[PDB]
């Protein structure tokens, strides 16, 4: 009081020395339930995959991806991600996700790497120099191979010229090694394009069926449709706490409200154009916010 009044003597007076403000602690973040998971499991565990000549193409949209499930397990033989770190992939929210699945032999898993020379890499399936994606592969000898050899999976071995990135061309007409044409009858200098994989259990690790899922992540002008999951660990009440509800933030005490609210609304406004009530996104209960305790000492 002596410092505020700048006098060593004070007598029978009431004085406002300073202002006290309660500081919030235990900042919590609340987001809705992680519902509508993307079906990454479908492409990875598909009963039958497709041969690389016509690799299966998948589009993932309007869902949340738990990339963690793919990268938490150590089962996959090869987990290679180019440009995008698997850690914090959930945070990296992308507008379009493309999943490409094909069965190749082990010697060539390496070929899928961007800018690699190869008979599977250039003639059949080619990733771009700018590939923001991940390459996942596992050995599945007991799943694809059958006794008597496997002719189920096929790959073009001869093509007139290389194919551009992300281009699959199903051509079964007889190939043209030289100048004269045999018109679709297989013969000398005239070979059918498709070549049998011939998968077998007794074969070397290199010549075994390796199903390969290739993820791609794409950013365009269009708004993001494939975001990652968010943490909604705990909700605290009856105390001054800093909250974050759907981008809207604020420091205040969270209490229950007894008045009725509409189902489609999610925010609340006071008469003073200030936030009065905040509806929980994943909980039906309403959280009535109040300003933190502040006054003059």
């Amino acid at each position, epitope marked *: 009081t002596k410092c505020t009044l700048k006098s060593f003597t004070v007598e029978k007076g009431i004085y406002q020395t300073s202002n006290f403000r309660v500081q919030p602690t235990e900042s919590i973040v609340r987001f809705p339930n992680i519902t509508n998971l993307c079906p990454f499991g479908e492409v990875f565990n598909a009963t039958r995959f497709a041969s690389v000549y016509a690799w299966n193409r998948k589009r993932i949209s309007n869902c949340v991806a738990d990339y963690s499930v793919l*990268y938490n397990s*150590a089962s996959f033989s090869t*987990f*290679k*991600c*180019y*440009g*995008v*770190s*698997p*850690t914090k992939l959930n945070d990296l929210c992308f507008t379009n996700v493309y999943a490409d699945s094909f069965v190749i032999r082990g*010697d060539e898993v*390496r*070929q899928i*790497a*961007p*800018g*690699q*020379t*190869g008979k599977i890499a*250039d003639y059949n399936y080619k990733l771009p*120099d*700018d*590939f923001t994606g991940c390459v996942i592969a596992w050995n599945s000898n007991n799943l694809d191979s059958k006794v008597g050899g496997n002719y189920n999976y096929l790959y073009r071995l001869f093509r007139k010229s290389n194919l551009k990135p992300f281009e699959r061309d199903i051509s079964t007409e007889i190939y043209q090694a030289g100048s004269t044409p045999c018109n679709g009858v297989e013969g000398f200098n005239c070979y059918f394009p498709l070549q049998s994989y011939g998968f077998q259990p007794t074969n*070397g690790v*290199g010549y075994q069926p390796y199903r390969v899922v290739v993820l791609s992540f794409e950013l365009l002008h269009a708004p993001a449709t494939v975001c990652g999951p968010k943490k909604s660990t705990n909700l605290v009440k009856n105390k001054c706490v800093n909250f974050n509800f759907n981008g809207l933030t604020g420091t205040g005490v969270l209490t229950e409200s007894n008045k009725k609210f509409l189902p489609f609304q999610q925010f609340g406004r006071d008469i003073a154009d200030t936030t009065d009530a905040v509806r929980d996104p994943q909980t039906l209960e309403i959280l009535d916010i109040t300003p933190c305790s502040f006054g003059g000492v």
Partner: antibody
Framework: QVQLQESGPGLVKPSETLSLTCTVS??????????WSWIRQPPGKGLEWIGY???????KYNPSLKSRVTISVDTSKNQFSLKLSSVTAADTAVYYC????????????????????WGQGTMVTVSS | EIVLTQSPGTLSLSPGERATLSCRAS???????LAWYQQKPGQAPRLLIY???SRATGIPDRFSGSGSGTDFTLTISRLEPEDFAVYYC?????????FGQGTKVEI
């Protein structure tokens, strides 16, 4: 298929900066994933790394030669270059362009298999 | 910088004879990022073997990487006249990246 073609002076007089350009073929230099590099081999001695280029033209150099070495890129020209200042006779060697590809992993090491494709090389000698 | 020692520096083995190059890093590399490079005389080096054990793109299965951590070993089988060249080991796990002196196999 991503061949690298070295282009440099055959003989350089001393006290002259050494300029060597890799004429890349078929790869946009600014690909993020590729991290091209420079390697030299003094005769009768092991290969020595000079420096690589981080994506977007940013560059990192071997700390030993960092003071006298700068790496430049010319994406407009589809080639990248190495400039070494104050070269001596000992510094000169057969210089080799090289490519590296960096892939992230669950483990988290951005670093990855490297020196997949080498240029033909060019024997450079520095003497009076 | 980490120093890689190649033992023995020189070898004289008949074709069809098994060879082993002991590349022992001074500091252990857990990632097994040591990669073997074959340089043919008067020619640019090629990637012979990577990730401790690999077959490159066309490298013969005959060559096979081995070892982990402090020491690494390269094994050749059914040696061919085309496999007489200097071999190198490189660590990209830590930077600066260094190469070994090189081992030359002769007839």
């Amino acid at each position: 298929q991503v061949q690298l073609q070295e282009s440099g002076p055959g003989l350089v007089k001393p006290s002259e900066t050494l300029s060597l350009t890799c004429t890349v073929s078929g790869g946009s230099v600014s690909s993020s994933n590729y991290y091209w590099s420079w390697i030299r081999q003094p005769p009768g001695k092991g290969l020595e790394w000079i420096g690589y280029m981080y994506y977007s033209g940013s560059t990192k150099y071997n700390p030993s030669l960092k003071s006298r070495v700068t790496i430049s890129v010319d994406t407009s020209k589809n080639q990248f270059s190495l400039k070494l200042s104050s070269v001596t006779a000992a510094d000169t060697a057969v210089y080799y362009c090289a490519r590296e590809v960096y892939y992230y992993d669950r483990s988290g090491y951005y670093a990855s298999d490297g020196f997949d494709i080498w240029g033909q090389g060019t024997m450079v000698t520095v003497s009076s | 910088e980490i120093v890689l020692t190649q033992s023995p520096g020189t070898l004289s083995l008949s074709p069809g004879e098994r060879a082993t190059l002991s590349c022992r890093a001074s500091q252990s590399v857990s990632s097994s990022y040591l990669a073997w490079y074959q340089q043919k005389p008067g020619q640019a080096p090629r990637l012979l073997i990577y990730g401790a054990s690999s077959r490159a793109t066309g490298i013969p299965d005959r060559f096979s990487g081995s070892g982990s951590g402090t020491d690494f070993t390269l094994t050749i089988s059914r040696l061919e006249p085309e496999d007489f060249a200097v071999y190198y080991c490189q660590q990209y796990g830590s930077s600066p990246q260094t190469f070994g002196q090189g081992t030359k196999v002769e007839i």
